RNA sequence: CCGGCCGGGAACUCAAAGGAGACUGCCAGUGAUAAACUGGAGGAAGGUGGGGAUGACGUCAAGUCAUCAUGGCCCUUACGACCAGGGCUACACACGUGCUACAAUGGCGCAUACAAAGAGAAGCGACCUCGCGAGAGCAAGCGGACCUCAUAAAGUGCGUCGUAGUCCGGAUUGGAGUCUGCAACUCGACUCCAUGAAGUCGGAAUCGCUAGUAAUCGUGGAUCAGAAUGCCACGGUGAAUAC
């Protein structure tokens, strides 16, 4: 789904684990009941795609944004296709 | 029974007849009767006069009828004279708090025209 | 509303407001940053706020202060 | 559009899974996508080799890919340089130390992947479809094969409307769940577009 | 001595123990009128004991879990009738005839796709 | 009912009086699957009915319900391309089923305080057959009496 | 003492594997409790089956994870030497935590 | 230490694997002595036991070129790409599907009982302290029949309200906040105080349901940083009626 969008997604992940989880430290530790200075609330001139709330969780194969399933990492369409062929282990039809 | 204004409520439990005062609901009324040391389920009949003006003395400590109506009106006028979104929105007569006007804005907008 | 800790403005708008009050209110400011809570030092400036297509000038009065910028720049034109 | 995939409704009954690793939720998607990459690669790079199945299993941080193919000699080659090349690149893809095996599919005209790939190859060599289908049904019924149905579809012979024209011989009991129905499907990218080839092969009743 | 019945009913399970004795009923270390005997139809745990009577016949220590009020109660009824192997297969003529040894195998039907609940189909517009 | 002739399921009798008749009456009264509430209403209302009339419980109920049972009812045919309202004889199970439905419905119509008073006053108004459910029975019997010409 | 907790998607495969670990352990060492079964986790997935509109057509699927617990009591050196490097299972996750 | 709490017991619930079981098998009657039907016994279940999965050849040149793949056509300093702000949330209106109501079979306050199914590591997050509350602080335990989400609610027992637009109903609006997130103005969710519309059972018409069903009551999950009255599941109470 539009190559550009998948490339954009990889950009957001790479910035997400470059800056944040290392300087997202700020928003967890210094924005707190400690002193204060306005400074670390203004030290969010980090490139806005380091934010991990900007990944979409696209389908791993087709990049489809909607219908994602976090367990399999795929959209519902590729979950069904692969589920029926037998590449998803353990998964089968359900009836109860 | 003429408490907090021209408000005269009576023949009803004191937690609920106090709710007739514009600016006290159930919570604030429990606060008035607890602060004045009055049981919650006595009427205004069967309640003494010194007891009544202890309720007057307690209801005087919150912003009620006139002061509250002009405080609310003052807030809305400040918004409509700012010309913010909440003021233009408040001014046209359309829902303020980001609700749906495509359909079902009907309290705020009034019964349907043609 | 929001935020027990700090209000919000962008750092570029912080610097443009500091330089705007230091060297006097000369010109309206191009601001895209509608995210931004009006500060009391911003009183008297003319800050044009982007409404999707146009920067509309907002003259800051004293009672603008507990508000975002974009409240004074409507985005949809309804007739 | 209305029939269930006849492999998927038999997954616990008679048919096995082509992936037989266990994994928790942390690495289920990663193992699964790594399987898409090794089947994608290993399907593209053995297009001439007539490959039927590729079965992945992961015993303790190592992949074990089994290539069910009809021509094992062309997969292995003159002393098996091609196999060690393939496990080198599968070890590159999956990131684990790779093993690789080759299972010889004898009777290749009873395997639906090989039949659909056959008919697809013939359709993209511009032969008429009735020969491809009809020959496939005849030579598949010739060796065992208690039933077979083939079904091509879509703009057949370069038309401007799309037909199907399926054939079948013998018994293909598709609602019976203990039926060993070997079903598979290919696509023929011709100069008129895609032609879909499905083939069901009924082998036995349990 | 000590006589057991398994006795389940819509997601309940009532262990029913019987010794011969008085007419007391002990359910989860609690009396009958205190467990659900403040509520609807405590009679149904007493229905198997009106086919030949319990007046001072047998003390029963019962322990039920899972289910609701009526589920637990029906589970105890089935549990006592399964636990009337105290007397022989005599009782299970007449106890069969009241419809008490039947495990009532009505369970909640599953919700099905495209239906709001088990059979209530969502309403369909014009035609 | 197109094909399937049916059985019927057996209701448990009333836990105070052992009456399956009155058990079906608390099922007719019950709303939203709340049976405890409905049997509380029936026990209160029939208890004040037994106290008021002084007879007994379920013979005061059986008299008050005996005055509202329909004899025959109208029923549509659509046989000869016409709408006929033929009179037809009511089956006994349907007879007292209609009796209870009319008592309960008329008791929901009344304007007293509690449901036990609405239904106790409705059964008391049906004991000397002057209530609303008896007007429903006389209405049904005027329809089947006017249209007697179809049998 | 030594709990070995096995998980797999196929119940024939897990009770084969745990039968092998039981007879291995109590053959070499001693005091194996037994394959206690520990409820199956059924994870259900309800996907839309069509590539466009059509909500009401859905496909329901499940993955059943089976556990077994063994709980070998005696810490013989022979049973921990003989218990390692001997699984011959492919779709089983073992946990050999003490 | 009165709590399965401990030693212990493996009976029981239960867990999960393997078996048995239900086939008109037996009996009576009716029937071409046939198929079968009606009734009866035994049995947990009786006649495809209940439910699901399973959807024939084809129909609608039905839906999807926007999941993907793809023939041809078309743009290829642009119909491609990057960015910020906006919009998809607009509102004289009309329709669909739902939720909450109009109350006393109820509202509110106090006490108290009984579930099933699930999810959880960049996660679920006890206990304890602070806050009226949403929540905050320190922080165990748990990759999990062990810990957490997590108190089921209708129910029941007391008291009150008393047929009032009312102690119904909660929309709307003002103020004060909490959390998530670079960021809640357009345009979140939740909390507290205040406000307290419309609505008193719905015109023509129309819909769903045959038994653990409808109705009604809660709980969970997927997507998800945060956002469900929707969707998918789970149990509690539990009908009426079918000539």
From Swiss-Prot, chain A:
Q: Cite a single Pfam family from the UniProt record.
A: Ribosomal_S14
- In the UniProt record, the signal sequence range is none
Question: Coiled-coil ranges per the record?
Answer: none
UniProt-listed GO biological process terms: cytoplasmic translation; ribosomal small subunit assembly; translation
**Gene Ontology molecular-function annotations:** rRNA binding; structural constituent of ribosome; tRNA binding
Q: Which Gene3D superfamilies match?
A: 1.10.287.1480
Q: Which UniProt keywords apply?
A: Ribonucleoprotein, Ribosomal protein
Locate the transmembrane regions by residue number. Answer: none
Q: Which GO terms describe its cellular component?
A: cytoplasm; cytosolic small ribosomal subunit; small ribosomal subunit
So which domain of life are we looking at? Bacteria
Subunit text: Part of the 30S ribosomal subunit. Contacts proteins S3 and S10.
Main function:
Binds 16S rRNA, required for the assembly of 30S particles and may also be responsible for determining the conformation of the 16S rRNA at the A site.
Similarity-based family = Belongs to the universal ribosomal protein uS14 family.
PANTHER family in the cross-refs: 30S RIBOSOMAL PROTEIN S14 (PTHR19836), SMALL RIBOSOMAL SUBUNIT PROTEIN US14M (PTHR19836:SF19)
Q: What is this protein called?
A: Small ribosomal subunit protein uS14
Gene of this entry: rpsN
Swiss-Prot record, chain B:
Result when mutating residue 104 to K: In PW097; partially suppresses a rimM deletion
Which Pfam families did the record assign?
Ribosomal_S13 (PF00416)
The reply to whether Ribonucleoprotein figures as a keyword in the UniProt entry is yes
GO MF, one term, reads:
tRNA binding
Q: Which InterPro entries match?
A: Rbsml_uS13_C, Ribosomal_uS13, Ribosomal_uS13-like_H2TH, Ribosomal_uS13_bac-type, Ribosomal_uS13_CS
Query: What keywords sit in the KW lines?
Result: Ribonucleoprotein, Ribosomal protein, RNA-binding, rRNA-binding, tRNA-binding
Please name every pair of cysteines joined by a disulfide bond in this record: none
Biological processes per GO annotation: cytoplasmic translation
What residue spans carry the region label Disordered?
A: 93-114
The residue stretches assigned to a coiled coil in this entry are none
Q: Which GO terms describe its cellular component?
A: cytoplasm; cytosol; cytosolic small ribosomal subunit; small ribosomal subunit
Q: Enumerate the NCBIfam families for this protein.
A: uS13_bact
* Job description of the protein: Located at the top of the head of the 30S subunit, it contacts several helices of the 16S rRNA.
Family assignment from sequence similarity = Belongs to the universal ribosomal protein uS13 family.
Q: How does it assemble?
A: Part of the 30S ribosomal subunit. Forms a loose heterodimer with protein S19. Cross-links to the P site tRNA and weakly to the A site tRNA. Forms two bridges to the 50S subunit in the 70S ribosome, contacting the 16S rRNA and proteins S19 and L5.
Know the name of this protein? Small ribosomal subunit protein uS13
Q: Which organism's genome codes for this protein?
A: Escherichia coli (strain K12)
From Swiss-Prot, chain E:
| GO BP annotations, alphabetical order | cytoplasmic translation
The record, for SUPFAM superfamilies, names: Ribosomal protein S5 domain 2-like
HAMAP family assigned? Ribosomal_uS9_B
Give one GO term, molecular function aspect: structural constituent of ribosome
**Functional description taken from the UniProt entry:** The C-terminal tail plays a role in the affinity of the 30S P site for different tRNAs. Mutations that decrease this affinity are suppressed in the 70S ribosome.
Organism equals: Escherichia coli (strain K12)
GO cellular component terms, semicolon-separated: cytoplasm; cytosol; cytosolic small ribosomal subunit
Q: Which family does it belong to?
A: Belongs to the universal ribosomal protein uS9 family.
Q: Which UniProt keywords apply?
A: Ribonucleoprotein, Ribosomal protein, RNA-binding, tRNA-binding
This protein's name: Small ribosomal subunit protein uS9
Gene3D superfamilies tied to this protein? 3.30.230.10
Give the record's subunit note. Answer: Part of the 30S ribosomal subunit. Contacts 16S rRNA. Cross-links to the P site tRNA and weakly to the A site tRNA.
Upper lineage: Bacteria, Pseudomonadati, Pseudomonadota, Gammaproteobacteria, Enterobacterales
Swiss-Prot record, chain F:
- Species source reads Escherichia coli (strain K12)
Gene, per the UniProt record: rpsG
Q: Which family does it belong to?
A: Belongs to the universal ribosomal protein uS7 family.
| GO aspect biological process, one term | translation
Q: What else is known?
A: The strain K12 sequence is shown.
Name assigned to this protein: Small ribosomal subunit protein uS7
Q: Name one GO molecular function term.
A: rRNA binding
The domain of life is Bacteria
**According to the UniProt record, what happens if one changes residue 35 to A/E?**
Defective in ribosome assembly
Its annotated function is as follows: One of the primary rRNA binding proteins, it binds directly to 16S rRNA where it nucleates assembly of the head domain of the 30S subunit. Is located at the subunit interface close to the decoding center, where it has been shown to contact mRNA. Has been shown to contact tRNA in both the P and E sites; it probably blocks exit of the E site tRNA.
What is known about its subunit structure? Part of the 30S ribosomal subunit. Contacts proteins S9 and S11. Cross-links to IF3 and the P and E site tRNAs.
One GO term describing the cellular component: cytosol
Q: Which residues of the full protein are shown?
A: 2 to 152 of 179
Keywords tagged on the record? Ribonucleoprotein, Ribosomal protein, RNA-binding, rRNA-binding, tRNA-binding
Altering residue 115 to G: what's the impact? Significantly decreases affinity for its own mRNA
